[PDB]
Structure 1
Amino acid sequence: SDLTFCEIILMEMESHDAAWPFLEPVNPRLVSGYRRIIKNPMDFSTMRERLLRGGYTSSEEFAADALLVFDNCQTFNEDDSEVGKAGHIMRRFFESRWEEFY
């Protein structure tokens, strides 16, 4: 019930123009080296699956999961890569919205 704003963030991030790298889990078969570099994958649909089924005890580890998305993105992709550029936009969107609400 305090995750009222978490679904608003998630719903806006899902529909955001720059969300295309994070809408489904990275497919390690198509992304060379992803499996070995990123040991805790996270993506918006997994956050969706987890939020619906209810496993977010506070807005705290919602943010932890979102921040994991953008931390994985910066670990794996160069800042000037196409996926990197989208990640930065998504990460600033998230930070921006999160402080607008908390």
Structure 2
Amino acid sequence: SMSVKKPKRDDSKDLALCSMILTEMETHEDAWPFLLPVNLKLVPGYKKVIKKPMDFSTIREKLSSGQYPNLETFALDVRLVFDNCETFNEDDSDIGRAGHNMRKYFEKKWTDTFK
């Protein structure tokens, strides 16, 4: 509350560390469904169904341009990528399996880096 603060957590390396995690996600072999925005002209249903499209390239550009105020807003967009993928894709599809795998991979790096 006013003039009453918990001790200051060092957040000065967060930007660098999120960039590193994002590099690791970009270079994973199962990243291909997520590298670029879904083509809303070429994929029926996507525009109407997925209210907030997100992809790794869009996260990389937001990250690079100071559009994440803190590491939680960064994790929210990463998780959005996988939540969208589960919304639109069966679990027993290549893309559906890719998304589960990538979510697992991300969540471990997140825990190991920050928790």
1:4 matches 2:21: no
| Larger-Rg structure | 2
User: What is the total number of aligned residue pairs between the two structures?
Assistant: 102
Aligned equivalents of 2:54, 2:31: Cα separation in 1:
13
Deviation at 1:30, TM superposition (A): 2.2
Aligned equivalents of 1:80, 1:34: Cα separation in 2:
19
2:107 is aligned to 95
TM-score scaled by length of structure 1: 0.95
The one-letter code of the counterpart of 2:106 is F
> What CA deviation, in whole Å up to 9, does each residue of 1:5-50 have, x standing for no partner?
1001101101110000000000122222111110100000000111
CA RMSD in angstroms, aligned pairs only: 0.9
The one-letter code of the counterpart of 1:9 is I
User: Which has the bigger relative contact order, CA under 8 A and spacing at least 6?
Assistant: 1
* 1:9 alignment partner, SS class: helix
1:18 is aligned to 30
Aligned partner of 1:76 among 70, 81, 88: 88
> Gapped runs of 5+ residues in structure 2?
1-11
Aligned equivalents of 2:25, 2:98: Cα separation in 1:
12
The one-letter code of the counterpart of 2:109 is R
> Gapped runs of 5+ residues in structure 1?
none
Aligned equivalents of 2:47, 2:86: Cα separation in 1:
15
TM-score scaled by length of structure 2: 0.85
Runs of 4+ in 1 over 4 A off after TM superposition: none
